[PDB]
Amino acid sequence: KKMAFTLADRVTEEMLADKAALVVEVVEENYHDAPIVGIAVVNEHGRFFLRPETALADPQFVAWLGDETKKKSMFDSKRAAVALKWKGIELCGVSFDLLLAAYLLDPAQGVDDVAAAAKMKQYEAVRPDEAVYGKGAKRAVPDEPVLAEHLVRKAAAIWELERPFLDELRRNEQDRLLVELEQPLSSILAEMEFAGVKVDTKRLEQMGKELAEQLGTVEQRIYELAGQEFNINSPKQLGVILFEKLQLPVLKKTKTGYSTSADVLEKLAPYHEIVENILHYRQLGKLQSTYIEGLLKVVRPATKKVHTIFNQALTQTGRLSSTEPNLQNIPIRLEEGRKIRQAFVPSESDWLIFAADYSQIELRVLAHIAEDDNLMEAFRRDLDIHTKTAMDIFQVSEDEVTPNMRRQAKAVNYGIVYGISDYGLAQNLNISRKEAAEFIERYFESFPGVKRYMENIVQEAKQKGYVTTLLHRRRYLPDITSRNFNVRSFAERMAMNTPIQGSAADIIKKAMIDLNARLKEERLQAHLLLQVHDELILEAPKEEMERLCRLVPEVMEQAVTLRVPLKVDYHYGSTWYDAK
DNA sequence: CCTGACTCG
DNA sequence: TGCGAGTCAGG
Ligand SMILES: Nc1ccn([C@H]2CC[C@@H](COP(=O)(O)OP(=O)(O)OP(=O)(O)O)O2)c(=O)n1
Ligand SMILES: OC[C@H]1O[C@@](CO)(O[C@H]2O[C@H](CO)[C@@H](O)[C@H](O)[C@H]2O)[C@@H](O)[C@@H]1O
Ligand SMILES: OC[C@H]1O[C@@](CO)(O[C@H]2O[C@H](CO)[C@@H](O)[C@H](O)[C@H]2O)[C@@H](O)[C@@H]1O
Ligand SMILES: [Mn+2]
Numbered sequence: 001k002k003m004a005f006t007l008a009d010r011v012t013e014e015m016l017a018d019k020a021a022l023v024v025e026v027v028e029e030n031y032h033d034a035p036i037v038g039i040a041v042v043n044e045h046g047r048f049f050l051r052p053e054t055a056l057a058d059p060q061f062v063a064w065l066g067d068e069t070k071k072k073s074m075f076d077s078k079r080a081a082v083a084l085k086w087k088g089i090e091l092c093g094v095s096f097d098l099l100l101a102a103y104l105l106d107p108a109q110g111v112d113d114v115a116a117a118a119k120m121k122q123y124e125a126v127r128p129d130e131a132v133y134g135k136g137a138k139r140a141v142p143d144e145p146v147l148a149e150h151l152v153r154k155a156a157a158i159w160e161l162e163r164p165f166l167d168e169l170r171r172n173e174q175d176r177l178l179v180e181l182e183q184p185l186s187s188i189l190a191e192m193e194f195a196g197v198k199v200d201t202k203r204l205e206q207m208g209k210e211l212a213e214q215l216g217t218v219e220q221r222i223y224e225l226a227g228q229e230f231n232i233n234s235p236k237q238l239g240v241i242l243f244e245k246l247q248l249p250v251l252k253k254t255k256t257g258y259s260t261s262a263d264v265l266e267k268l269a270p271y272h273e274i275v276e277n278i279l280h281y282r283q284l285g286k287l288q289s290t291y292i293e294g295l296l297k298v299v300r301p302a303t304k305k306v307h308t309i310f311n312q313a314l315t316q317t318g319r320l321s322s323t324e325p326n327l328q329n330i331p332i333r334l335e336e337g338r339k340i341r342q343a344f345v346p347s348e349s350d351w352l353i354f355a356a357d358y359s360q361i362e363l364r365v366l367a368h369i370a371e372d373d374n375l376m377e378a379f380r381r382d383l384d385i386h387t388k389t390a391m392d393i394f395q396v397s398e399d400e401v402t403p404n405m406r407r408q409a410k411a412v413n414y415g416i417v418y419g420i421s422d423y424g425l426a427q428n429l430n431i432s433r434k435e436a437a438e439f440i441e442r443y444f445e446s447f448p449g450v451k452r453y454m455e456n457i458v459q460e461a462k463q464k465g466y467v468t469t470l471l472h473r474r475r476y477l478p479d480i481t482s483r484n485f486n487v488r489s490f491a492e493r494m495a496m497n498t499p500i501q502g503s504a505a506d507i508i509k510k511a512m513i514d515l516n517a518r519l520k521e522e523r524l525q526a527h528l529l530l531q532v533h534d535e536l537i538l539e540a541p542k543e544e545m546e547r548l549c550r551l552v553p554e555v556m557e558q559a560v561t562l563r564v565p566l567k568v569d570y571h572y573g574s575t576w577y578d579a580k
Numbered sequence: 581c582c583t584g585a586c587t588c589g
Numbered sequence: 590t591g592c593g594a595g596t597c598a599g600g
Contacts, residue, residue, distance in 0.1 A: 233598050235584060256583065286586045289597055317593055319589080326595045329588035337587080362589090411591090420591035428591090489590070497592045501589090505593095533589040533593085 001125065005040075005047035005152040007144075011055060016064040017043035021159035022072045023151045024080040024091075027133060027141060030324055031079045032193070032307045033086040037141050040151035042159045049148040056087060068092035073162050075099050075114050075154065078312065081190040098158050100182045101165040103313035104174050107475060111313065114154045121164050126150075126157045174472050181471060182312070185509055188516050189310045189320075192528050196305035197327065198347040200575075201296065207339065208292035211284055218281045225274035232281055235260050248272060267430065283334065291331060291340045298325050305347070310531070317498050318473045318505035319533055328532045330576075333407065341577035350542045352572050354526070355579040356552045357535040358508070359567035360385060365470075365503045366417055368562040372449025379564040386410045393429065416443050417450065417500070419493040454496055461495035469502030470560065471510075507566075508534055511559035518555055522547070537576070545572055 008015070020043035028034040039050040055061045064070050065084070073096040074080060081091040102109060102117040111117045115128035132150050134140050141147060169175045223229050226246070230237040239258035242248050248271050252259040262282075265275045299306055311321040322328040330344070331337025346353055363385055367375040378385060390401045390409035415425060416439075426436035444451035458480075461467050466476040475498045479491040512531065519526060526540035526548060536556070540548060553568040560566075573579040 231599075233585080234600080235598095236600075254584075259584090261585075282586065286597080290587075290595090294596070311594095315593065319593060321594055322588095323595070326588085329586095329595065331587065333588080415591050418591045424591055486590075493591065501593060504589095535589085 003047065003125075003149070003153060003156065005049055005148065007049050007148055009054070011050065011058040011061045014045040015041050015043070015048050015050075016060065016070065017045060018069070019043060019071045020073070021155040021162075022074050022080070023155045023158070024074075024084065025147075025151055026079055026083045027139070030309065031083045032309070034083055036083055036087065038147050038151050040148070040155045042152070042155035047152050047156065049152055051144075056089060062089055066090045066092050071095045073098070073158050075117070075158055076313075078186045078190045078193075081187065082193055085190070085194045094183065094187075095179075096158075096162050096166070097178075097183055097186060098161065098165065099313050100186065101169060101178055104178055104182065104473065105165070105168060105172075107313075107316045107318075114157050117165075118157050118161060121161055123157060123161055126153045172472065172474065174474070177471050177473065181506070181509055181513070184513050186312060188512055188528065189312060192530065193307055193309060195527060195529070196300075196303070196307040196347070197529050198303075198305050198345050199295070199299050200343040200345050201299060201304055204292060204296060204340075204343045207343075208288055208296075211288045211292065215281070215284050215288065218277055218284065222274060222277050222281060225272070225277065232278060233285060238278070242268070242275070246272060246274070248275075263427070283336070287331065287337055287340065291337070295325055295340075308530075315505075316475055316494075318469060318502040318509075320505075320531060327530055338577065342575045344576035346539045346574070348539070348541065351539050352542055352545060352574055353529075353576050353579045354538045354540060354545070354548050354552065354570065354572045355535060355576070356537075356556060356568050356570045358504075358556065359569055361504045361507070361534045361566070362500050363413060363417070364562065364564050364566060365500050365507075366450060366453070367564050369470075369499060369503065370450045370453035371563065372447050372453070375447050375450060376564055382567075385413055389413050412439075416440060418497045419454075419489075457499060458492050458495050461491075467495050467499050469499055469506055471503075471506040473502050473506060475502070504534060507560050508536070508556075511556045512536065514559055515552065515555045518551060522551075537579075548572070 020041050023040040024036055025038040026034050027037055036052045036056070039052055039055045041048045070093050072094050074094055075098040077094040077097050084091050098114065098117050099111060102111040102120065105120065109116065109120065113129040115126050118124070118126055127150060132142065166175060169178055219232065222232060226241050228241070230241055232238060236257060238260050242260065243250050243258050248268050250258060251264050251267055262279060265279050268275045295306065306325055308322045308325055308327045311323060314321050331340050364379060367379055386406050386409055387398060387401055389412055390406050391397060393409050393412060394405050412425070415428070422433055422436040422440055425439065426433040457467060461477050461480050465478065466474055468474050475494065477491045477494055479487050480495065482488045482491070508531065512528065515536070516528065524540070524544055524547065526538050526544050528536060528538050530537040536552070549570060553570055556568045557566040571579050
């Protein structure tokens with residue numbers, strides 16, 4: 001605990017070195033158009049601190065940040081780049097991101113600051129962000145001397161830990177995953193974040209108005225059937241109405257009381273018609289509060305755009321998450337909700353929304369990884385397994401399978417491949433638990449390869465302590481040999497799923513890098529807007545639609561090569577809704 | 581702040 | 590007693 005640094009007045013030559021650690025401190029958790037409160041640099045020549053109004057105005061510093069031959073090591077470089085694009089400054093030459101490096105080494109650590117990453121290497125010369133800035137309503141940037149030291153210490157740490165982290169990544173054969181997949185992707189996400197998505201507020205406000213009219217309607221109806229007023233959005237009061245006043249049977253409890261989950265409500269339908277009305281009310285209430293009122297609170301009024309943050313170092317399987325707003329969970333399943341998408345539009349004049357989508361991506365990953373004959377064959381002829389399961393459950397034929405019921409048989413295929421027990425399956429389809437068992441038992445005799453993959457990956461996880469995905473992403477399962485049935489089972493199901501979801505996650509990540517490449521090389525104006533786990537979303541001038549119909553799917557299928565082919569569905573239209 | 585509800589993959 | 594997420598209302 002003793003460090004020398006220079007609290008600089010101006011940018012000097014010795015700070016513009018070819019290799020350095022860089023800290024562009026942004027305290028606000030949502031970094032979009034957020035204050036940059038301090039800058040630090042560590043290189044061969046020394047340790048420096050700079051005030052932002054100094055460094056960001058000095059054209060030489062800006063030129064050094066923008067030069068990709070001047071290599072930077074950073075912690076969460078997406079935060080920096082974005083907070084810099086809002087200051088009209090471009091960041092280039094990031095060769096090491098400690099955050100991503102740490103997330104690949106172990107997603108469970110849930111690293112959020114340099115101190116926690118340093119924790120993994122015994123490096124103790126840096127304080128965590130909360131012990132410096134404060135918590136919640138106390139969150140305060142301290143006095144400069146304190147601020148400076150801390151930032152310099154963060155650089156110093158990034159500076160000392162680069163090699164160790166890279167050294168460990170090389171042993172696990174995860175170095176190329178960092179440098180060639182994750183890190184390049186970080187910059188792409190920073191663009192999509194900054195470009196934003198344009199929203200039709202006029203339309204959005206009109207719908208919430210209509211939604212309110214329907215909410216009051218359904219609501220009155222609910223009080224009439226119940227013969228009283230209560231708070232529908234209060235599960236405790238609703239529970240009293242349904243199970244105490246109305247006497248409806250209790251199908252399930254939780255640790256705090258009676259259950260009123262959608263699943264329980266659908267099963268209570270024969271007994272009383274208020275349950276269906278509650279379901280419908282809850283549906284509309286969510287649309288209003290989250291997808292109208294939530295969404296309008298985060299639009300930037302001047303440009304009518306929303307800017308989400310794609311949290312890259314958070315999920316345990318390798319997926320991304322989307323926050324403030326979440327644009328990866330916009331309604332589509334029920335026609336009423338699906339309408340919200342009409343308000344998502346192109347940002348320019350004659351531009352359109354292109355939406356490409358992988359077909360059964362996790363079922364193909366399972367096929368490739370488990371090497372199952374009957375499964376690999378079905379895909380080679382181009383059978384639709386969801387449609388092959390739609391019939392099998394809905395007694396129907398291929399000729400009449402509505403999109404609605406290809407989604408309900410979709411969750412059965414996936415459910416089965418991810419350790420759903422017969423209790424789960426029967427409780428999802430309202431069928432006999434004996435019949436549920438039969439389905440599964442048949443499935444594993446029909447696909448013996450998939451069954452043995454399940455047995456094997458659990459065995460391997462017990463022996464190794466972890467599982468891995470195609471591009472060597474890793475998840476550790478320390479609870480895998482727990483004596484407790486519940487604890488053991490949960491980790492076992494993670495040993496089944498992770499390699500699959502994680503692999504689909506790797507693939508679509510790679511597909512984005514190649515797409516971005518194939519875009520800038522062909523000099524097109526088209527650019528990525530969103531990723532929703534297994535689908536990409538772009539906007540482009542009307543003219544470019546021809547190339548994209550050929551380009552986008554070609555890139556997504558050619559990303560990786562598997563023991564089965566990869567298929568992509570695509571559509572375009574003037575609204576994200578019409579892109580169906 | 582947590583629990584349970586809804587939303588997506 | 591299928592997996593991975595986020596946000597919101599009530600208590
Ligand atoms: N009920 C569901 C739906 C989705 N998923 C996970 C596993 C698959 C991954 C992608 O699913 P979708 O994009 O919904 O469908 P797909 O099978 O990948 O492709 P398609 O749209 O052609 O059915 O998300 C899941 O576990 N359970
Ligand atoms: O930018 C995402 C990146 O930031 C970190 C901390 O450096 O997470 C913080 O910001 C997130 C996005 O706003 C919040 O969800 C989270 O609460 C906060 O810790 C990284 O963990 C994350 O990858
Ligand atoms: O360095 C990580 C990198 O290794 C890759 C690419 O070479 O996988 C290769 O090495 C693996 C074992 O050494 C094999 O599974 C594979 O056959 C081989 O291509 C990437 O998957 C990984 O990111
Ligand atoms: Mn898909």
